[PDB]
Structures are given as structure tokens and as C-alpha cells.
Amino acid sequence: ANSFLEEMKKGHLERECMEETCSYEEAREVFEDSDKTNEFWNKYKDGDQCETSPCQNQGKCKDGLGEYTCTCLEGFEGKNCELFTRKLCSLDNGDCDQFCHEEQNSVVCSCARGYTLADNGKACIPTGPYPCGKQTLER
């Protein structure tokens, strides 16, 4: 309180206790004391309100007050799994760095020679040193 060396110590209470799990040895070495760590541990903090299941599809949460992330069912995407899967690319090149051409509710991007693919298909991983179109970032 009202000290430069004390603001960094109290900053670990709202992070290594609220976002993840708490512990007794967390605020002992940081505070460099023993009188305030014991008082903070005596007050338990239930995390969180996941017993009533705020999300659908019987999803569970984690040890976090407020924010949470559930494993919703497939076919539904978005924040609370609302938007369906993407059907066609057409516009915005389908979020892929090559040709976008729909095949009746089926889009797949792939580079030709001189380039390969990634693990999912977001962008073609460069392989050759200088094929027919690159940029030199050496300088």
C-alpha cells in the first residue's frame, strides 16, 4: 500500500489465484512476509459457478470466476457455438492464401509446385528458396 515495492507483490493475488488455482506458497515468497499470506488463505474462493451449468449441451467450465470455455458440440461454431460451418469460400479468398473455388458445399485450398501445405491449411508453408515469387527480408 502506497509503495513501489508493494504494488508488484499484491499484483500476484488477482492472477495466481483467480485465473488458476491458489496455493499457500504463492503469496509467501512474493510478499516476503508471513502475516498477510495466512489471512488471505483463510478466506476460500469458490471457482466457479459451474454447478448450475450456465452453458448448454451439459458443458463444464474451469477454475475461473466469470470467464470460462466449454466443449460444445460439433456443427456449431462461434462464441457460444451458434454459427454453422462454412459452406463456400467465394469472398475473402476463403481465408486461404491461394485459389478459392467451391465444389458444391466443399472448399479446399492447395498450392501448386514450389509450395507445400501446413497442418490445417491456413497458408502454404514456404519450402523453396526463390521459386517464382518471394520477398527478400534479409536487410
Added chain:
Amino acid sequence: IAAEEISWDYSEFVQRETDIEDSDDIPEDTTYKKVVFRKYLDSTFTKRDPRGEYEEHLGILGPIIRAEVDDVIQVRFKNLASRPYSLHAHGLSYEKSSEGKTYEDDSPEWFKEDNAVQPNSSYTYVWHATERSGPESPGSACRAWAYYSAVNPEKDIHSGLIGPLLICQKGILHKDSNMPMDMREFVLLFMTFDEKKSWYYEKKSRSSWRLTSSEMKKSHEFHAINGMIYSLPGLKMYEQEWVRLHLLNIGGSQDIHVVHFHGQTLLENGNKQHQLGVWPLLPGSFKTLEMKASKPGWWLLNTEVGENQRAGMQTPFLIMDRDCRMPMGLSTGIISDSQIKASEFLGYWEPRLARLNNGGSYNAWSVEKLAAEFASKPWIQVDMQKEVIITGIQTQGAKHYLKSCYTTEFYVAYSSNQINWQIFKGNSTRNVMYFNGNSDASTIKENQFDPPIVARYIRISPTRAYNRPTLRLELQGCEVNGCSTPLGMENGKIENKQITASSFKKSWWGDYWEPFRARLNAQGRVNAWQAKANNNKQWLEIDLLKIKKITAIITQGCKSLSSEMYVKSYTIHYSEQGVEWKPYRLKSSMVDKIFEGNTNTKGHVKNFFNPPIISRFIRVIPKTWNQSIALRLELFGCDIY
């Protein structure tokens, strides 16, 4: 998007929104069998979008979608009644996959399937956002569109199945749920709605159907303005605002109006070379242009017509003050929260004793013990029995040794009729389901409001603090007319040449007093004006240069770091362009008014005055007094044109 059949009332002026007369009996039925839209955050029901404070212009119309570049919002629809509904957009060169018009097509059940929605069955449908609606040329940045049904070009626009497609540009966005705002745009849809010309026509009328309603000619076809009649809310802006106004007219093809504002010149953007002044409307296009206000007051909003004013629209828009940051109930001693209502309190400390930095370890708000506080209902009805306008409320905790003790989160509510509690303040423009709060104890925290919220039954409710629920909410309102602004009697704009003192006290073998600092919260020697004599002869003249309209006043008093003196009564002398030291006339009779000075020591005096004080050389002569002459005179005038 939904479309549940809900009977909407066209003749809404009986609700007494801004109406004056009371003998307005409806011959037929007030409500009409129509359909209203609704916005859902999910694909299923049981989850509606709360209409925020900014979502005002709608009436019978549902929500307004805001989709821009790289931002698409789904529009899942499910029929609830027994008739298949449709939805057709306008603007871009959209294909039949997102069109929805009943004509020739190609796909079996996809190009025209949205026009035939089976009851109790959802359907996958989503529109596409383009870049055509973006107004080119340096000037504007928004241009709205329109969308409605398609099962009938005429039986749908009267069935309450309308909707504007407000689309702006890309480049300027705000943090209001990732929606591009950073302004204060408005949209109005002026189009009459008919009950006899709709799909939900119940074969008969609510009174007569011989010669198109024998009571009134086309009584079912009322000129409903923005879904209602004699309403038009949210027209509460401030002085000099270049806000954008969207004028949309698609159905009214044989109704040409010319908008003319009472004392507001126009300015066209884009070319930056036109002034215009007036601007009519053409059927089809979506005209949009700025407003640029000038003088405050209840300026009438009309279209210079005889059939759509006294029987259509007649709502004057109000312009309130911009710099109305004067003390309301903290620095004064008259206006206080004595009329506070609640149910559950927070501890044992004193209720009203909640001033900023006060002596003692008991300074908060409570009457009954708190026991346990959580997400219950510790509502605090902050009623004022009058009109209110709040743009910012501060929040400060309490401490006396080391503890913080601060409220981390609290939800706000409001009401306008006491019988119902419209708990919807937490979902305003930026807020959706939360609100700011205090952080520490020695640092003052404020909560500024964006929308000009107006009500009468304000309600706040805390949640849980640092093991000690203690709140000290202040009060900060604003004017109603929009002209009562401080001319600088306490800030510094009014120099000493205008407000002059009387005698100057000077000791023989010592120093000398400087009683020319007659302002609010002054330091140094004295704090205001303290004359040498102590009778009913001293004066305190003020030069107002021009004529002003004074309504509110304030007066504290000074001291000498030992004893506190003040004035108990004074008289205001009004004049004109010349000179006339005559007291202010009493409008309730014919005599002069007897004003009262400072009541206690430091509690200010707040009083309203309806009759204007048209003068320039206002003189104040203190009659009675307390110990010695002392007062921090400061008034609130206007700019009478």
C-alpha cells in the same frame, strides 16, 4: 430475427409520452393486429436481445442490424403463427441465395424457401455484407438501406414487417460490442400503416367498414410516426452537434415533405461547397445529412405540411446544456438525498453521512445491518420527484487504517412510473450486462454515462465489496432548458471590473484585507467579500454587460481562519440598459422580493426562479447578517437573444 404476431398500438399518444391534452378518446381500437420483429443472440428462442437505450427508434419495427466489412451476424428465423413469412433485402447486387423475392428462380427450395417458412420450424438463412453502401467522397461515412417481406409488395409494409439496413464504412470503429459508432446517428421511418390493407385483416373492422371506416376516413391507416403517434423520443442533444440523421422513405411514394428546422441552418458534406438550408425528400432513396444545432430550447420539429403535422408528427426536440457540471447536492446544503428509498442497507454506519473525506470512522450509507450481501436485491431507489439527466456519477470507498473497502461491481436500474421497475440501465450503449466500479480508497473513481438517460425513479444496487459493503455515490445532474450556464462568477471569466466590492479593510500596524475575491472556493487571505461596516447599507454590484435570464443561484460565505460569518438575507436590484437601482419586482403581486442569504455556515442556498431577471447592473444589498458581512455570491444566467 423473429416475427411473433403481437398486436401493436398505433395511436400511442394516449400513453402520455410528451402530450398535453387529456380528452383524446379513441373511437375504434387503440391496438392493431400486426406482427413485430425481435432480435435473438442464438438460433433458438427463450433468449431475446434487450432493447438498449440507443435502440429507441423502432416502435412497431423490430431491431436494426449493423453488419459491415469482415463482420456478419446470422439471422435465423422460425415461424410461430400459421402463415409463412418472408424477408427481402435491398441495396447490393445480391443473388437469389440471399434475396428472397417471390419471382422466377433456379434452385428448388433455397432461392424461394425463405419466403415460405413453416410454423414451428427453423431455417438456415444469412445475408451478405458488401461495400457499396459506403458513401464515397470526403464527407459522409454512413448510408442506410431498407428490407421488408416479399410475399406481397403492399400487404407487408402495412403489416409491421419493415426494417432499415444501416450500413456505414470501414475504418472508424468503436468498442461498443465491436460495432462501428464513435458518433450519435439517428434513423427515422415515416410511413403510414393500414390494418385493412394487410394479410392479418380480420375480415371486419373494429367499429365500421362501410365507407372506409365511417368514424374517420382510413382510421386504420393512421400516419404512425416511427411506429407510434405523437412520440419521437431520444431527441435530447446538446449545443452544436454535427450528428448524422438518416431519413428513409420507401412506402410513402405519394407524400413529399420538406424538412425545415426552426432556426438551424444546414450544411452539406462531401463537396464541402453547399449550404442549402432546407432539404426535402424523394421516395426511394435514403437521404442522410448532418444537423448542426445552434441555440438551445424546445425547437419544434415539423415538415411544413397540413395533413402530417397536427395529425402526424409534432414533437419539439430539446437541447440541454453541455457544460452543466455545477454542484447539485454535495457542496450545497439545500438539495440533499433526504427522499431516498431502499430496502436492504449495508451495515451500521450513518445513511446520509457519506461526504468525501469526513472525520470519523463512520461515513457511508446504511440503516439496517447487512448480515449477508450477494446477488439478492439491495436496491436503492434514488427518487427525485422531478426530471433528471445524469451523465456521470463518481464512486469513492472508505478507509481509516489500511483496508481498501471498495465496491467492485454494481448494477443500475431506473423507472418512470414507480408501479413498474424497468431494470434496464445496465444494458445501455456501451454496457450490456455490467457496470464500472471503484478501484481503491484514496483514489476517486467516476462512472461517466454516454447516453443522455432521462427518468425520475433512479435505482442503484450494490453487490459485494472488500468484506465491507460501503458506497458513497455522489449526484451530478444537468439543466433542462439548456441555457442556464455559469457566466464565470466563480471560474474566472468574469473579471473584478464587473463584480466589484465595497469597502477595503486595512489595519494600521499590520496587513490589509482583500475582499475582492468574491468567488467560490478561494484561498489566500479571505475567501469572499467582507466589508468594514456591518449594517444594511453595503452593496455588491455585478455588471452583466448584456441582458440575461437568471434562474439558479448559490451562496456560501467566507471566514478569517477563526470565526465564520455569513449573511442571512439580501435584496437583488434589477435594472436595464441604463441605470436603475430598483429591487427585483415580485411577479406574484406588485411589490419587491425579499431574498434570503446563507442559512448556516457553509451550506449553500439553491433556489429556482421562473421570472427572468432581464438586467445588466444587478445589485445585491445584504439586509440582515450574521456576525459580519460575508457571502460567496454566484448566479446562473442565460443568453437571451
Added chain:
Amino acid sequence: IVGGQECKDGECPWQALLINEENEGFCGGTILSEFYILTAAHCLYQAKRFKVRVGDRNTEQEEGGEAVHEVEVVIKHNRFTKETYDFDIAVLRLKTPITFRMNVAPACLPERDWAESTLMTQKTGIVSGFGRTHEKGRQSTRLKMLEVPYVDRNSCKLSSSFIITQNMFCAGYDTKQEDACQGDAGGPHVTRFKDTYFVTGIVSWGEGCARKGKYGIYTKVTAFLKWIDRSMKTRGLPKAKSHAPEVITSSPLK
């Protein structure tokens, strides 16, 4: 504001300087492969001889053994208007093959499909050239390549008194500063589309070059696919490995 910045000594190969046997240049070219060099037709017609050297970043000086790409003979073009400018594209028939080095990087061939997706997205572009289109008083010794934006087609027919067709369009700033006749004639206006590089512009002089701050004139090789295809397969396989590859063709470019 990004001004007239010079080209880098790394990713700037497209600069086949077309000079003469003496110490006097005329225009430049475009590097794409080893059998064709895109450039303007007035570079050779109504001019002088032809001497090409790829990977030559400076005319007065030399960066070692890098500038070597001699040309035997050359032909003209069918749609090339001698008086004005239209489809002003000519192919330089080299005599010695050159491998792919650092200053000599190949590029993929264009196609007709990259005509509706390259002009609406990449609204900018770069103009590589030593500076021989406006050889008046700005002859810089360093290879300059400034950046120029793309403007709507409805503002290109009035930039010059000559009526411009679809093959050439706007490719410069507004009527503010000097954004025309930038670089050498036949200079590549390559626009970095997406993971590749496709040239799509040739700077040429219309009525010469004077007070042309309005807009620029740059071709579009996406429609020039039928000409680069008729002059590559009909000539047959390389006989003596790029002799002529192959200059023995008719004047209207087959």
C-alpha cells in the same frame, strides 16, 4: 509519404536494361524466364540498335560479372500503334541463356484469370526502371522504383488527349506530383498479388513526357496471354538453345 525510393539489391530482378553498342541507353525490359523479355515496341522501332543486360542495377558503374544478356535481332507487334500507344508490348529475343542468380529471379507466367482479382484488390503498385521514359532532367544513376496507386478507369481516358482502350489504364497518384513516365520504357509494373509476382504494366510515352502529374499509362498483360502463347509454342522447341528463341517470326508477332 513514401517518395521515390530506389530499388533493393535483393528482390528487384525485373530490370533488363535495353542499351546500345555505345554508351547510350534507351529503355528497359522485364525478366520472367529465359526465352522472352517483355518491353515496349518503340524501344527498338523508330530508335537504334538493341543491347540487353540483365541484373544491371547501374549503367555508369558495374557490380561485377552480372550484366550479360545480349540480343541478336528483334521483331515488332501487330497491335502496336506507331503514332500513339496500344498493346505496346515487344519480346526481346536473347542470344545466350542465363541461369537463375540472385539479381536474376524468374517469375510465374500470367493468365487471363488474374484480371478481375488483381485490379480490385491491389490498388497500388511499383514501377521498376532506371529512368529512361522521362530522360529530360531527372536521369538518376541509381535504379529507382517508386510506389504508385491505382485509380478508377473513368479517370484515365482524359489523362492524355489520346483515347486509351482497356489494355492500358490508370496507375499513379492524383493530379498532385510527378507520377508518370517513371523508370525506363517497357518497365515492369509488377504487383505482388499473393505468394507470387505477376507483371501487369508497361510504361510508355504518349505525346512524350511533360507536366504529366495527372495519371500514368501502363498495359495489362492478362489480356496479352494469346500473344505470349502464339509466340512460344508455334516457334517450336529451342533449336540452338535460345538463338533467337525464336526471332525467325513474322512482324505482326505471328
